[PDB]
Design a protein around this ligand. Structure first.
Ligand SMILES: NC(=O)c1ccc[n+]([C@@H]2O[C@H](COP(=O)([O-])OP(=O)(O)OC[C@H]3O[C@@H](n4cnc5c(N)ncnc54)[C@H](O)[C@@H]3O)[C@@H](O)[C@H]2O)c1
Ligand SMILES: NC(=O)c1ccc[n+]([C@@H]2O[C@H](COP(=O)([O-])OP(=O)(O)OC[C@H]3O[C@@H](n4cnc5c(N)ncnc54)[C@H](O)[C@@H]3O)[C@@H](O)[C@H]2O)c1
Ligand SMILES: O=S(=O)(O)C[C@H]1O[C@H](O)[C@H](O)[C@@H](O)[C@@H]1O
Ligand SMILES: O=S(=O)(O)C[C@H]1O[C@H](O)[C@H](O)[C@@H](O)[C@@H]1O
Lengths: 363, 363
């Protein structure tokens, strides 16, 4: 197995999930980790469990000559500046950049121009499509088992945002807002599943429950914690997103349903084991419901135990790394492009704007 | 048992469901049926199974001296004119008037003035709240078991509109549109459950699938067959409605979820037995999902077999009749008032307008 040397820029929560997944893939060697918070470097080094060179600044990692590929897992509002440095570095390194790829309309416009002239693989790390149960419903939709598709519903019911370094995720300025930070994944799935582009978005949401009295270094937390979104698409399909960040009692965290003119399909995805009751491992299900003849078929979709244990996104990060590896080695394309990243972000920003202004937003 | 003599104005599909439910209630006697379609009279008479007087015109039924109470189950666009004749008749008869109570903004304004001066019970027959599983979740919400309520989602996945006499239900002018005809029930449940009034509605929907090969003197149906709706409320709660009229493969026809800041509750309601596979009786469920401690509780909500067999609305029409009986006997209130009927209609009209204009509508 050809060795790829990975550099991690950002060494927090999600970086450690990247570490655990790369450990499952022969040929993967972390050589370099950059993070301006020493305790993050220590904790990530322990997770890696073998010697790496650490850096406080990403520019030193880029100049290190230690790496064949990068992973960026720093806070959302830092993604553009890190990417700009990579583009100007002359290293020509591949990049897996965590979602959201950026956090504002200005950032998005700039990244679009810059990324156009960069030739190395740039993959946006929206991994949800590779969850085995999600893959089944995408294959169903694309194969025509559902007929012509008209509707897509995504319901996410989960716990409040977790505690992060410097509390970065508690503020819209740093995150893009909830509909970008948490929901870009879902807007991307909408494009993928419907194979269509959005034309109009409306959202209603509020900051109603979570983190209400929390101030950090003189700032008040201002993130939406529940919302509904309706998205219209060019081809006369429509999708709906429901989010609650205070519905963590729900055994199933995600429900995704697709309705076509020949059938319906629905996946239910359990809470990750590390957040659920220690005890009852529940499996994800896919239920296919043809219009005629009546007779829904439901089955469980198992994930390999090691793939599943390595992350909190139901095996998806592992398949993302297989895909990125093939891109680095020039044996595969980038499945999730900058342009996918930009569309999902602009959809999320349009949603955040709709929530504020109480009006639908055109795209 | 105190006898109530019922007059039916409109003797089609839903009237026969009224007949079957009144048959379960001691003291109920149908004496009079008015319908301008002879075949409807015959078919309803057979359902009743005992001699009744029949009329082609409702005015003759009102003058008959045969009745203590009325049920109106004629096409939606006729409800107002029949009610006006009852109000001006001087009979002072109680009325159970099928939903939607009316079909346009003008009708609604007129009915509001007229109904104010009428003193006999006028009950709008939105019965869904009395479905045993729906009753449980309303009791849960109102009792505070969920904490403060923030979100309400209603998903209806069902078969295309059934065939009616004169195909009345295939046209928006005659129905109020899909969001009035089919969805007034749901908008009313939103008001009931949230105990709040709507301020803004947005809906996306289309006529995408159904009734495309049905031609009626050269006209096609113009009714929506799928939609999403978001409703904001005065108190900063929000609800979402999802409708598909071409999702009849779904084992569960209705899903309703309420999310509060202490817990979530969710009911699933099966397709009525005469529309589903002959064979698998599925029960309705209610699942209670507290935020803390984790531990969802799910149970079946059984309905009495006779109550269930008498209707296609999961036992609800029977409890509606018990309620209306008490109103007629002067011993109970009208649970679902004209004003409830008018609000649900105005909500639906606003949704129909939003679908057309691609903008949110104020209330
Ligand atoms: N794809 C997914 O499923 C998923 C899941 C979780 C997080 N994320 C994403 O991962 C990223 C990080 O989130 P997290 O949960 O790991 O947060 P975290 O707070 O645990 O980690 C962020 C780390 O970045 C470091 N950092 C801050 N500024 C930096 C800079 N300029 N350069 C380098 N490092 C910097 C911090 O010191 C910290 O160690 C975000 O973009 C988030 O959206 C994605
Ligand atoms: N609450 C519910 O669950 C529910 C269920 C089904 C129908 N409905 C309502 O019941 C009503 C009737 O629908 P249906 O499914 O029984 O339709 P249907 O077409 O089966 O019956 C309608 C009947 O009304 C008669 N009619 C037509 N014009 C009339 C008039 N001017 N005066 C008197 N009768 C007239 C027709 O001849 C026919 O027999 C509608 O308002 C519909 O919205 C409610
Ligand atoms: O739970 S938090 O860590 O607060 C927030 C994160 O949660 C999930 O894992 C999502 O995939 C991710 O996109 C998001 O950044
Ligand atoms: O199936 S149809 O009869 O066409 C349409 C009817 O559907 C259900 O029975 C609803 O309760 C009723 O409101 C509506 O009028």
């Amino acid at each position: 197995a050809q060795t790829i040397r990975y550099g991690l820029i950002g060494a927090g929560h999600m970086a450690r999930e990247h570490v655990r997944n790369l450990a499952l893939i022969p040929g993967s060697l972390i050589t370099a980790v950059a993070d301006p918070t020493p305790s993050s470097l220590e904790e990530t080094a322990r997770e890696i469990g073998y010697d790496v060179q650490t850096f406080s600044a990403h520019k030193d990692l880029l100049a290190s000559g230690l790496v064949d590929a990068l992973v960026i897992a720093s806070p959302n509002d830092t993604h553009l500046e890190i990417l700009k440095d990579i583009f100007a570095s002359g290293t020509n390194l591949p990049v897996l950049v965590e979602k959201p790829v950026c956090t504002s309309a200005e950032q998005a416009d700039e990244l679009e121009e810059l990324a156009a002239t960069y030739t190395a693989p740039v993959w946006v790390a929206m991994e949800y499509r590779y969850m085995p149960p999600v893959q089944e419903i995408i294959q169903a939709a694309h194969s025509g088992k559902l007929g012509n598709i008209h509707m897509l519903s995504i319901v996410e019911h989960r716990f409040p945002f977790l505690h992060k370094v410097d509390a970065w995720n508690r503020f819209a300025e740093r995150t893009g807002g909830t509909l970008v930070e948490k929901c870009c994944h879902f807007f991307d799935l909408m494009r993928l599943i419907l194979q269509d582009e959005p034309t109009r978005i409306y959202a209603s949401g509020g900051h109603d429950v979570n983190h209400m009295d929390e101030v950090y270094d003189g700032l008040i937390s201002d993130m939406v914690d529940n919302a509904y979104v309706i998205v219209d698409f060019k081809g006369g399909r429509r999708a709906m997103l429901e989010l609650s960040m205070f519905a963590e009692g729900s055994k199933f965290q995600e429900r995704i349903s697709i309705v076509g003119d020949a059938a319906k399909i629905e996946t239910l995805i359990p809470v990750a084991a590390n957040h659920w009751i220690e005890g009852d491992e529940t499996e994800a299900t896919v239920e296919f419901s043809p219009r005629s003849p009546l007779g829904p078929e439901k089955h469980e979709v198992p994930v390999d135990e090691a793939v599943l244990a390595a992350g909190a996104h139901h095996g998806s990060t592992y398949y993302e790394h297989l895909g990125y590896r093939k891109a680095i080695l020039g044996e595969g394309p980038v499945d999730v492009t900058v342009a996918d990243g930009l569309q999902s972000v602009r959809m999320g920003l349009a949603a955040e704007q709709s929530i504020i202004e109480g009006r639908a937003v055109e795209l």
